[PDB]
Amino acid sequence: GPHSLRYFVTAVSRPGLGEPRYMEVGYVDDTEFVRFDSDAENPRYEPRARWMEQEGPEYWERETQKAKGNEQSFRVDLRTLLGYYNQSKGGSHTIQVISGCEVGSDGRLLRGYQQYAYDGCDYIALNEDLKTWTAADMAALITKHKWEQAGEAERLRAYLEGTCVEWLRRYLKNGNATLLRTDSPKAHVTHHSRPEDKVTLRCWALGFYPADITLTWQLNGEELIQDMELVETRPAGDGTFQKWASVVVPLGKEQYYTCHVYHQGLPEPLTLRWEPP
Amino acid sequence: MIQRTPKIQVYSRHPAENGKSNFLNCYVSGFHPSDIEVDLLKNGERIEKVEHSDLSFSKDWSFYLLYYTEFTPTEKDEYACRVNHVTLSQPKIVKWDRDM
Amino acid sequence: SIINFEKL
Amino acid sequence: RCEKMEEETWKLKIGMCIQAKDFYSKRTDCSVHRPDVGGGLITEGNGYRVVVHDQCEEPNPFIIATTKQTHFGVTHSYIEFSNSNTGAPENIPDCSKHILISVYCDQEASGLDFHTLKYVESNYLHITVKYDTSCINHLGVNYSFMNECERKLTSIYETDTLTCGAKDIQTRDKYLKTCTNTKFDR
Q: Any idea where the domains of chain D sit in the sequence?
A: 1-186
Q: Distance between CA atoms of A12 and A10, rounded to whole angstroms?
A: 7
C–A contact: 3+ Cβ pairs < 8 A: yes
Closest CA to D10 of D106, D118, D92, D68: D92
What was the experiment behind these coordinates? X-ray
First CA to last CA across chain B, in angstroms? 34
Q: Please indicate if any CB of chain A lies within 8 Å of the CB of D70.
A: yes
In this structure, whether the domain defined by D1-186 belongs to CATH 3.40.50.880 is answered with: no
D161 vs B62: CB contact, 8 Å cut-off? yes
Return the C-alpha torsion angle D137, A224, D80, B89, nearest 10.
10
Domain coordinates of chain A in residue numbers? 1-181, 182-274
Return d(Cα A75, Cα B26) in angstroms, integer: 32
Determine the 3-state secondary structure of B4 from DSSP. strand
**Quick check: do C and B touch, 3+ CB pairs under 8 A?**
no
- Among left, alpha and beta (phi > 0; psi -120 to 50; other), residue A207 is left
Cα distances from A142 to residues A27, A149, D66, D101, in angstroms, run 30, 11, 35, 33
CB B67 within 8 A of CB B40: yes
Shortest alpha-carbon distance between residue A230 and chain D (Å)? 5
For chain B, domains (ranges, CATH) are: 1-100 (2.60.40.10)
Q: Name the minimum distance, in Å, from the CA of A149 to any CA of chain C.
A: 13
Q: Are A227 and A248 in contact (CB under 8 A)?
A: yes
Measured CA to CA, the distance from residue A224 to residue A245 in angstroms comes to 11
Query: Distance between CA atoms of D48 and D106, rounded to whole angstroms?
Result: 5
Torsion-angle region of residue A36: left (phi > 0), alpha (psi -120 to 50) or beta? beta
Please judge whether D159 and B59 are an interchain contact, meaning their C-beta atoms are less than 8 angstroms apart.
yes
> From the list D120, D158, D161, which residue is nearest B2 (CB)?
D120
> What are the two backbone dihedrals, phi and then psi, of residue A174, each rounded to the nearest 5 degrees?
-85, -10
Whole-angstrom distance between the N-terminal and C-terminal Cα of chain C? 21
Pairing of strands D98-105, D126-132: parallel
Nearest to D156 among A111, A136, A232 (CB): A111
Q: Where are the alpha helices (DSSP H) in chain A?
A: 57-84, 140-150, 152-158, 164-179
B23 lies within 8 A of chain A by CB: yes
Name A194's Cβ contacts closer than 8 Å, sequence gap at least 6. A200
DSSP D99-159: EEEEEEESSS-----EEEEEEEE-SS-EEEEEEETTTEEEEEEEEEEEEHHHHHHTTT---
SS3 D30: coil
* Contact flag for A and B (3+ C-beta pairs < 8 Å): yes
Q: CA nearest A233 in D: which residue? A: D167
* Mutation for testing the D interface, residue in A93, A103, A123, A134 having most D CBs under 10 Å: A134
For residue A263, count other CB atoms closer than 10 A to its CB: 20
Q: Do A150 and C6 touch (CB under 8 A)?
A: yes
Q: CA B26 to CA B80: how far, in whole Å?
A: 9
Question: For residues D11 and A5, what is the distance between their CA atoms, to the nearest angstrom?
Answer: 32
DSSP-assigned beta bridge partners for residue D126: D98, D121
What are φ and ψ of residue D45, in 5° steps?
160, 150
Cα A241 to Cα A150: distance, rounded to the nearest angstrom: 45
Give chains near D: 3+ CB pairs under 8 A: A, B
Helix then strand then coil, % of chain B, to nearest 5: 0, 50, 50
- Phi then psi for residue A173, to 5 deg, are -80, -15
DSSP one-letter code for B6: P
**A164 → chain C, closest CA residue:** C1
D140 in Cβ contact with D17 (< 8 Å): yes
Most B CBs within 10 A among D16, D22, D115, hence the mutation to make, goes to D115
A238–chain B Cβ distance below 8 A for any pair: yes
CB contact under 8 A, B1 and D119: no
Domain A1-181 has CATH 3.30.420.40: no
Q: Which CATH superfamily is domain A182-274 in?
A: Immunoglobulins (2.60.40.10)
CA D99 – CA D101 distance, rounded (Å): 6
Determine the Cα–Cα distance for residues A148 and A165; give it in Å rounded to an integer: 24
What pairs with residue A3 in β-bridges?
A103
Amino acid symbol at D68: K
CA atoms of D119 and D132, how far apart (whole Å): 16
- By the 10 Å C-beta count (0-12 exposed, 13-18 middle, 19+ buried), A242 is classed as buried
Pair D12, D145: CB distance under 8 Å: yes
